[PDB]
Design a protein around this ligand. Structure first.
Ligand SMILES: OC[C@H]1O[C@@H](O[C@H]2[C@H](O)[C@@H](O)[C@H](O)O[C@@H]2CO)[C@H](O)[C@@H](O)[C@@H]1O
Ligand SMILES: OC[C@H]1O[C@@H](O[C@H]2[C@H](O)[C@@H](O)[C@H](O)O[C@@H]2CO)[C@H](O)[C@@H](O)[C@@H]1O
Lengths: 727, 80, 63
């Protein structure tokens, strides 16, 4: 009865101490080698040496920042049985804490209504007391297509939910369940399963047909405007000027399903957007949802999701309550974070979509310190933490009105410690005031977006939102269910991938320029542990490592074309530490994969994509950041123009290799020695740069073509012949 | 509005067959027509099997008069 | 490396025998340790070759 509902198991001591020792040894070796580089000059040409040593100093600092917060990685495992035994104990009303789920839809033209309907259905069919969940969908575009799609989904749910509940379905999402290659009778035992499943598949297909018909009808715009079924026109005719509008489906007022159990409430919201006021892309909609929930139904916790991300494991909220409801080890946790798992990814990782290294090494090893960093979607927040209050255990109305809104009802609804609604009770006042809460001038003389809710950053606001509450005394916690909790669709082509990395890098760059920067935010007052500060500094200054990187990518070839030296060579002293550095790095990688479980192939995919994406888009993001800062073309660039710096670098390195071959032709064994290191450096750069271009330009496996590569080699041979005949 | 308009090359498409269909009755009638096509395939396979064995005197038409194509290298013109 | 062409002859047969043994032994281990076709990985085999080269260099400097 007094057990904890979860336990934090440290990584096995035998499988972690060698890793720590190798890290310490690598630190010492790197320090000694850096001292050796600093002491020794070159005299012959100091510019290249200075550039190289500066690049290596920056690389060493980045390595320190990235690797230090990996001390004491942990894992967590939970006990749902005790939770159900102590809270869902039979004979009393259920006492599990309620939640609200937040789904934000931008525009159906890029997110098809079927994908959103899948997420809505997966949310509705969740395993959890029905009287304790509710879904809030924020339609930014105010379009009628999503409205009619939700009206269709609220009708199909009455059939989808009871069938899903009875037979315990694995994905609980229609399209991601009826498209499984695995056999669907592996462990089913009920006699009536086959007939009802074959009866429900047809209903799902008919629902798909209805959605496809709605899309086709909405594809053609009428002249005068859209028409609602009752008679009055749709208020969203002018996309840039429409009043606030909220509606409720499937609640207690709505009808029951097939068996008779009422569905979870599904409220559709659309905030007013008068022209002439600043509207925020995503933080504003989430803030409106948070403010509406306080008036409609107040819940201590809240989960958020993207349209493309559905719920795979049906007990994710029930598995987060073991962390958020324990008075012991959960009293000071501000949110629970799940890893982002993607569906439909190919066996080959064409452009690093799996993201194993991050979600498996960095965040798992960072869980030991105040929990991970808040990524985009798939995370359960505590309401009392978003309001700005510090964790517990260590006339007036005016300060509340400055802090958040001038709405008395919502202010009173926030003063309740856990759950509950203001004693108005009558639905008329609540449904007439929740439309007042989403006005266009609500967040004016208040603190919304600057200290409460979701921080009004620049492009990406998730990291600042998490860091604002980590800066206080709050903890967060990471969770890895055996059955993945949330699975989401993956980007289709590499152009979206490059746009995505550009957007993330630019968001980080702009974060590195405000008062919320992790480098010097709240140094006094503390409340934030130093290792978490280092992690945030890494997550902020990762793009800038691409500035020295370019130089270090070109410097070998630069010396290869003429000087062919970087440092004086001494085998007695420098060679031992030079080899020991690579040996320490290799041992570090081996011990990483010993306890992480990341495959070798994924490890090197991430390791090469480091440079590949750094030299392609991160220097660009730096150019936008510095250009915009100095200002006080600009929009997304073409996919092709992003990849010209790596191509230029590879071409220059290949030309340097050809020049080295020509010098070897001129060499008479007396100079056969020194050029080996330069060849090795250029070869390292080329091996890092080349495979991505191989994958891009070739649609076949192994080599792209045959005769074309052969003729490229032939042209290179003839070009070097012409260079030799005219030196 | 079917894309291939050929039965075997339509019912053997890996692509989803409800990508842009909007009519409410499409699914039931498609699943009713697939069975008819399979039955037609069975009938054709039966005809081939029956024709695989040559009779001694010659082929026989349904009406009564024999098939004029018994001698492959000598048969009158025939149109229907 | 120590040979000066005067001993370039006899070791060919020994190389052939060792190569026969290695060719018989290796592909099964390749299949076991690699889940991908052809070569298991890329950089790891490259670094194994690099480590072998540096080990033979250290052997040569200390014969
Ligand atoms: O453990 C791999 C780690 O490498 C980091 O850069 C290395 C790398 O050897 C090279 O860039 C430089 O010469 O040395 C540093 C020192 O570690 C890289 O920054 C990390 O992202 C990567 O995980
Ligand atoms: O995963 C979502 C999250 O990604 C962040 O970029 C990561 C990137 O995924 C990882 O591969 C690299 O090693 O580190 C960066 C820095 O965290 C991105 O910055 C976030 O905005 C985004 O929510």
């Amino acid at each position: 009865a007094r057990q904890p509902l979860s336990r934090k198991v440290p990584i096995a001591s035998s499988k972690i101490n060698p890793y720590r020792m190798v890290i310490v040894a690598r630190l010492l070796i790197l320090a000694f080698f850096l001292r050796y580089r600093i002491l020794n000059p070159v005299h012959d040409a100091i510019g290249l040496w200075l550039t190289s040593v500066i690049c290596e100093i920056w690389f060493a600092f980045s390595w320190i920042l990235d690797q230090f917060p990996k001390w004491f990685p942990i894992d967590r495992e939970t006990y749902l049985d005790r939770l159900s035994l102590r809270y869902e104990r039979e004979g009393e009303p259920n006492m599990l804490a309620p939640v609200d789920i937040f789904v934000s839809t931008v525009d159906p033209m890029k997110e098809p209504p079927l994908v959103t309907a899948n997420t809505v259905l997966s949310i509705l069919a969740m395993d959890y007391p029905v009287d304790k969940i509710s879904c809030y969908i924020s339609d930014d575009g105010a379009s009628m297509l999503t409205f009619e799609s939700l009206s269709e989904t609220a009708e199909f749910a009455r059939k989808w939910v009871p069938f899903c509940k009875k037979f315990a379905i694995e994905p609980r999402a229609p399209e991601m369940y009826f498209t499984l290659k695995v056999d669907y009778l592996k462990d089913k035992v009920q006699p009536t399963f086959v007939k009802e499943r074959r009866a429900m598949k047809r209903e799902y297909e008919e629902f798909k047909v209805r959605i496809n018909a709605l899309v086709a009808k909405a594809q053609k715009v009428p002249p005068e405007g859209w028409i609602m079924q009752d008679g009055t026109p749709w208020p969203g005719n002018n996309t840039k000027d429409h009043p606030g509008m909220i509606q409720v489906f499937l609640g207690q007022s709505g009808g029951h399903d097939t068996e008779g159990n009422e569905l979870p409430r599904l409220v559709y919201v659309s905030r007013e957007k008068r022209p002439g006021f600043l509207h925020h892309k995503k933080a504003g909609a989430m803030n409106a949802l948070v403010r509406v929930s306080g008036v409609l139904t107040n819940a201590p916790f809240m989960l958020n999701l993207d349209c493309d991300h559905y719920i795979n494991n049906s007990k994710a909220a029930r598995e987060a309550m073991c962390f958020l409801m324990d008075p012991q080890i959960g009293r000071k946790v501000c949110y629970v974070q799940f890893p982002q798992r993607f569906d439909g990814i190919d066996r080959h990782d064409r452009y690093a979509n799996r993201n194993t290294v991050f979600f498996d090494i960095n965040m798992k090893g960072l869980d030991g310190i105040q929990g991970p960093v808040y990524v985009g979607t798939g995370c359960v927040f505590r309401r009392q933490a978003l309001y700005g209050y510090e964790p517990p255990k260590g006339m007036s109305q005016m300060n509340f009105e400055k802090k958040f809104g001038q709405s008395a009802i919502f202010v009173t609804s926030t003063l309740m410690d856990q759950g509950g609604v203001p004693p108005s009770s009558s639905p008329a006042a609540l449904l007439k005031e929740a439309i007042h809460v989403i006005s266009c001038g609500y967040e004016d003389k208040t603190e919304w977006g600057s200290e409460l809710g979701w921080i009004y950053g620049s492009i990406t606001e998730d990291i600042l939102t998490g860091f604002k509450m980590h800066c206080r005394g709050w903890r967060s916690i990471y969770c890895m269910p055996k059955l993945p909790a949330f699975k989401g669709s993956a980007p289709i082509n590499l152009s979206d991938r490059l746009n995505q990395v550009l957007r993330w890098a630019l968001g980080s760059v702009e974060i590195f320029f405000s008062r919320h920067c992790p480098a010097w935010y709240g140094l006094k007052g503390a409340k934030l542990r130093w290792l978490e500060r280092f992690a945030y500094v890494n997550t902020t200054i990762y793009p800038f490592t691409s500035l020295p990187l370019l130089a270090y990518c070109t410097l070998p070839a630069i010396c290869l074309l003429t000087d062919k030296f970087i440092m004086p060579p001494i085998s007695t002293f420098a060679s031992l530490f030079f080899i020991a550095l690579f040996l320490s790095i290799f041992a570090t990688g081996i011990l990483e994969l010993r306890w992480s479980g990341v495959s070798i192939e994924e490890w090197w995919r991430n390791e090469q994509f480091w440079v590949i994406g750094g030299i392609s888009a991160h220097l660009f993001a730096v150019v936008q950041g510095l250009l915009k800062v100095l200002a006080g073309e600009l929009y997304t660039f073409k996919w092709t123009t992003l990849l010209i710096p790596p191509t230029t670098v590879l071409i220059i390195n290949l030309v340097g290799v050809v020049a080295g071959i020509s010098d070897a032709i001129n060499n008479g064994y007396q100079s056969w020695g020194p050029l080996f290191g330069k060849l090795f450096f250029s070869f390292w750069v080329i091996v890092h740069l080349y495979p991505f271009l191989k994958g891009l330009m070739g649609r076949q496996n192994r080599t792209p073509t045959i005769v074309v590569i052969w003729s490229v080699l032939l042209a290179s041979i003839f070009s070097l012949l012409w260079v030799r005949i005219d030196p």
